[model samples]
Target: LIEVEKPLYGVEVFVGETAHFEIELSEPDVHGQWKLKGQPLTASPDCEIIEDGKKHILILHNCQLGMTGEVSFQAANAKSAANLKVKEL
Candidate 1:
C-alpha cells in the first residue's frame, strides 16, 4: 500500500558561522520510509522515525557576531528542507 514512483526529495541544511551544525545524511530518499523533523530557531524537535542508515546532527547555539539560527527539515512526501542564512565569514 505504498507507491511513490518518485516525487519526494529530501536533504538540505546550510548553517555556517561558528555556532554549530553537524550533518550526515548524505542522501536519504527511502531509508526505511520517512518521518523526520527538525525545525530549529528556538525549539521544535521531537519527531523521528527514519532508521535505516543514520547520521543526522544539528547544534546551533546562541549565535551573535552575525546572527544565524535557522533550520527546517521535513520529509515524508510533504517534501521540505531549509537552512541557509548564516553570516560570519
Candidate 2:
C-alpha cells in the first residue's frame, strides 16, 4: 500500500546571505500539513493531493548565514505525518 499521510520525504536548499528550501511531498495531496513549531510559513493550506506532486518551496527568510533547524509536515489525518531537518548555509 502507499503511504499518503507521510507525504513529505525530501528537502533541498538554496544558499547565500539568506536561504530557501524546496521540499518534495510523497503524494500530490492538497491535504498536506506543515508547520515550523513557533513560526508561520507561507504555503497554501487548501490544495489537493496527488502522486505526481510538484516541488514545494519554503523560504527560511533569515538563515543566520549558517544554521540548522527542523521543519514538519502532516497528511491531515490522525496518523502518518512526517518532518525534515533543515541546515543553514
Best by lDDT: 2
Q: lDDT per residue, candidate 1, 1-89, as tens digits?
A: 22222332322333332233333444554433222243333332422232343333344433333332233333333232334344443
Model 2 weakest lDDT span, ten residues long: 45-54
Off by over 4 Å in 2: 1-16, 29-33, 38-53, 63-69, 76-89
Q: How many clashes (backbone atoms < 3 Å, residues ≥3 apart in a chain or on different chains) does model 2 have? A: 10
C-alpha lDDT of all candidate models, in order: 0.34, 0.39
Model 1 stretches with alpha carbons more than 4 Å out: 1-53, 69-89
Give the top-scoring candidate (TM-score): 2
The pairs that clash in candidate 2 are: 7-26, 28-49, 28-50, 29-48, 29-49, 29-50, 30-47, 30-48, 30-49, 67-88
Clash number for model 1? Answer: 0
